[PDB]
Ligand binder design. Structure first.
Ligand SMILES: [Cl-]
Ligand SMILES: [Cl-]
Ligand code: NA
Length: 129
């Protein structure tokens, strides 16, 4: 599923991301735009052999099982495929774990490079929230 901006903001808010660990909703919408272009089916292979999955591009080295990342963990206790669903529940639940890990939203390279320090509220402007 490819979300609209406000549609995604609304789903994220309902799943409790607005202000989660102090990150305003616009941070999460911004991260999703640049990680996945709001596409839940987005995948990207990394040099280390891990793969990023879903709307928040969650990586198999640590967070999910895909059966093909030797030596990896599955901290969210889910198959990576769960992160590709039209229903964002699994991605949000796992994202809450990631952002709690120690580095906050710096765990998302696109967030650090394209969202951090910008007017992130702009991502939720105009939305009925
Ligand atoms: Cl694996
Ligand atoms: Cl933080
Ligand atoms: Na894994």
């Amino acid at each position: 599923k490819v979300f609209g901006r406000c549609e995604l903001a609304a789903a994220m808010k309902r799943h409790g991301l607005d202000n989660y660990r102090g990150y305003s909703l616009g941070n999460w919408v911004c991260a999703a735009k640049f990680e996945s272009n709001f596409n839940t089916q987005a995948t990207n292979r990394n040099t280390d052999g891990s793969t990023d999955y879903g709307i928040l591009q969650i990586n198999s080295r640590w967070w999910c099982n895909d059966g093909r990342t030797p030596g990896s963990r599955n901290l969210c206790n889910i198959p990576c495929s769960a992160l590709l669903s039209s229903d964002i529940t699994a991605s949000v639940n796992c994202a809450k774990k990631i952002v709690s890990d120690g580095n906050g939203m710096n765990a998302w390279v696109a967030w650090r490079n394209r969202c951090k320090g910008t007017d992130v509220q702009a991502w939720i402007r105009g939305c009925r929230l």
